Write a protein that binds this ligand. Sequence first.
Ligand SMILES: CC(C)=CCC/C(C)=C/CSP(=O)(O)OP(=O)(O)O
Ligand SMILES: [Mg+2]
Ligand SMILES: [Mn+2]
Length: 429
Amino acid sequence: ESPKEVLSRVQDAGLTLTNPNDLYWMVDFLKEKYYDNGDYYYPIKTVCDGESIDVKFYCPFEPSLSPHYLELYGSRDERASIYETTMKKYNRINSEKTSAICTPYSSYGDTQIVAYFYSMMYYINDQTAHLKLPESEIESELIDILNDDILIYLNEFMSIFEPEDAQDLERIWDFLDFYQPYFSKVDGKIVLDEKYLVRTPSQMPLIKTICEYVSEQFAPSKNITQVIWEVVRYIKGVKDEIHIRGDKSFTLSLQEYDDFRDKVTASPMAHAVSDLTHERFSYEAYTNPAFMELENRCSEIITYFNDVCTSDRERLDEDPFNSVFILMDLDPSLNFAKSCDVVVEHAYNKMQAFLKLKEEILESASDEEERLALARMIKTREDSLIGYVLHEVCCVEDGYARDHKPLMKAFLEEEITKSLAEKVKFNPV
Ligand SMILES: CC(C)=CCC/C(C)=C/CSP(=O)(O)OP(=O)(O)O
Ligand SMILES: [Mg+2]
Ligand SMILES: [Mn+2]
């Protein structure tokens, strides 16, 4: 469309998330107003316990939206039929918007597989959210189902894992930890004992769709051990969350919260698959201690941004898994607004630590092939950082985001109207 057509639509109907064209103009505006002016502080306007939350998320990476978002959104109904879900739940998760904005320069299939991985985390997280309820309402059968589901999900990723190097087989085997007694090494493959294939989990078609794509697109030609490794780390992290939530006694420090969030942010899974889509790729980076820390910083940055945006909803859930609430429990002088400011500052320092590790990792490269591979893999994680910022910024329609921000809807509609009008006036210059 032309800027004149969109300006007329915005002046009449405002900004929506149901018209997928609006998101292209929102991301384009955010790049022009902020990134293109050297301003890397993107506004977040929400509320928590009636307090005004008006902060800026620092991220100096180029904003972009996937060209496949139109087709991804146009096929959202057939994509949702894979899931056991209501459309209200599927619309709030909005994996089409998440993947398109965090994986902006990939093929249609390589973008959709990222949407599948993020949707897997959201549906498993919502199943784990039953433990948020007070103990008077927790059903043991649902916990039994959850514990059995993640073990069956884990085995389905094991069924597509047949590494060419026996050392990679031992890497996953030793990483199973408390899940190892359930599995056995049978002819170069890790197999769950058939005694434990008890049920068909509710989201098994989703997990089978993921494993089918990974085994058909990357397994014949690439080493998919890290994709399996990050899935094991995530599934183990979910088990740790079940243990903590099931105990109903949250005593995690901010450092322990970071260590836990390093496992369950799920973005390392999407990065592992996205790394296999580029020729510039170094599997040895996954065991580099500096690269592992860079991935941990990325997960914590996304966590802290999420903690600010989801604070009010999780406050009503009485969910203690939030750095805003952990800091308030430690410091009684902090309200929700002052605590969010501290979290935003922590996210800035983690971003500087991310950029410092980046410079050290690229300098430690042995040859040009390794340098270009490391730079490509770090760029993939930078795409997710700016992508998640804009993801929360562009929550402008209620029901199509986990945390609708009506103040951002008003702010973006007012600001994009002035920007589009300036485009129409100076046209065609
Ligand atoms: C969306 C992307 C790019 C990565 C994952 C970020 C993310 C929202 C992780 C889960 S945070 P968690 O508190 O577990 O979940 P919510 O209640 O905020 O939905
Ligand atoms: Mg949380
Ligand atoms: Mn959250």
